[PDB]
Amino acid sequence: SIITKAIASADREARYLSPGELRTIRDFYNGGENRLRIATTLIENRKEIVERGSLKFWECCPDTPSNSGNRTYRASCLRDQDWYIRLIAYTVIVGDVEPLKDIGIVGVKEMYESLEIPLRNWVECIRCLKEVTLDLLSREDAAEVTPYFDCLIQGMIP
Amino acid sequence: SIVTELILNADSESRYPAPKEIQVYQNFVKTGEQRIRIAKILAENEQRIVQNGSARFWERVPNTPSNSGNERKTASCQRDQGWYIRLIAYSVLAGSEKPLEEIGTIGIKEMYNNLEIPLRNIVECMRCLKEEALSLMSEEDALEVSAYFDYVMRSLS
Amino acid sequence: SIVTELILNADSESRYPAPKEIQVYQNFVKTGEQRIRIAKILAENEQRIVQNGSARFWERVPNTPSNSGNERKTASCQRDQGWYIRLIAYSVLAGSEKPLEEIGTIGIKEMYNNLEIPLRNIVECMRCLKEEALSLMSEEDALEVSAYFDYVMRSLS
C-alpha cells in the first residue's frame, strides 16, 4: 500500500515520517470509506459480473481450454474469474495494487504457462470482465477500479 | 381462432355472420380433423424436434447461454423450444396465429431482453426448429406450420 | 437544440417564455465554451477514436460483416462510426439529443435491418467507441457524451 511504501521510504533514510508523507497518508485514510463502498459494490455484484464476462469471453475467445467441453476446465476458469474479481475488490479496499500484485500478478505468467493455459486468452477474459464491471460503475468509481484491471492485464501479457 | 375472427368481424359491423363467413366457418370445421392430426404429429415428435433443432442451432451458434456448460440454462432453452412447438400446435388447432401471438409473441423481445438472451440466437434456434418440424410433415400439412414459425421469427426481429 | 425545445414549449401554451425557461436558456448559453471545446476534442480525435474502437470491437466480435474480409464493408462500418461520433458532437453542441435523434437514431433499426447488420454488434461497437471517446474527456465533460452514446445504444437495442 501507499502507507507501507511511505513507511519503507522513511525507514530507508533512518528518519521519521515527513509532514508531506503524513499528509498523503491522511488523505488516503480519508478516502478509505469511499474505497470500501466501491469494493463492497464490486463484491456484491461479482456473480453477475463473472456470468456476463464469461459469456462475452467465450463468445470472443472460443478456442480456449475452458470452452472445450471439459467441465473441470470450465469450473476452474469461472473460479479464477471470481477469484480475480474478489482480488481486485480487496486491492480497491487497500487503495493500491500491492495486494493484488502480491497474490495474483507476480508469477501469474509462469503459473499459467505451467498449467498450459494461454495468457492471451486470460487477457481477453480480463478485458471482458473489465468491460462488464465498467458497465455497472460510475465514471468516478471506474477511475479507481480500472487501473487494477489494467495492471493485471499488463502483468498477464507475455 | 378463426371462429373468433369471423365473429368479431361480424360484430364490428353489428351484423349477423354473412353467408361468406358461414362458408369459411364450415370449411374450417371440416378441416379440423386434419388440423388435429397435425397437432398430434407436433406433440408426439416434440422431443425429437427439440433435440435435432438444438443440435443444428448449436452447430451454427455454439457460444450461446444454452451451450455455456450450464445445465439449468440448457434445460430452460430446450423447454422454451418445446413451449413454442406447443404454441404452434395450438395455432394449428385454432386455425390462426392468435394463440401463439397471445401466449408467446406479445412482449417476447422484452421478456428475452430481461433474461439477457440475445434475440438473434433465438431466431436461429426457431429457424432450426422450423426445419426439423417441416421435415416431419407433407407440404400441405406444413404450410400452416411454416407460416407460424415465420410469425415467431418475425416477432423476434 | 434545447433553445428550440424551450421556444416550442412556450409556444404550445401560446405565451412568452416563463422564468424557468429563461433560466434554462441562460444556463445553457453559459456553457457554450465548454460545449465548443468538447466538440473540438471529438472532431480532432475522430479518426483515433474510430481506429481504437474498431480494434476493440473486432476483438470482441470476430464474426461481423465489418470483419469479414470485405474491404468495402470495413470502410462502411468505420464511416458509420465516424458519422455517429459526428452526430454526438452535434448533440453536445445543441445541448440535447435532438440532432443525433433526428439524423441517426429515428429509423436506425429499420436501416440496419435492411443492411443485414446485426444490431447487437452495433451496440457493442458503440460501447467500444464510447469507451475510447470518454478517455479523452475530463470528468466535467464526460456526462453529456456518455449520455448520448447511451442514447444511441438504447435506440439500437
Partner: peptide
Amino acid sequence: SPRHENQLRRETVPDKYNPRKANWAA
C-alpha cells in the same frame, strides 16, 4: 511414511456441444 503413491491419483461426456467454435461462422 516414505511412500505417497496412493495420494497421487491425479485430478467424460462433454459439457458443451461443438466446442471451440466461433458463432456465425461463414
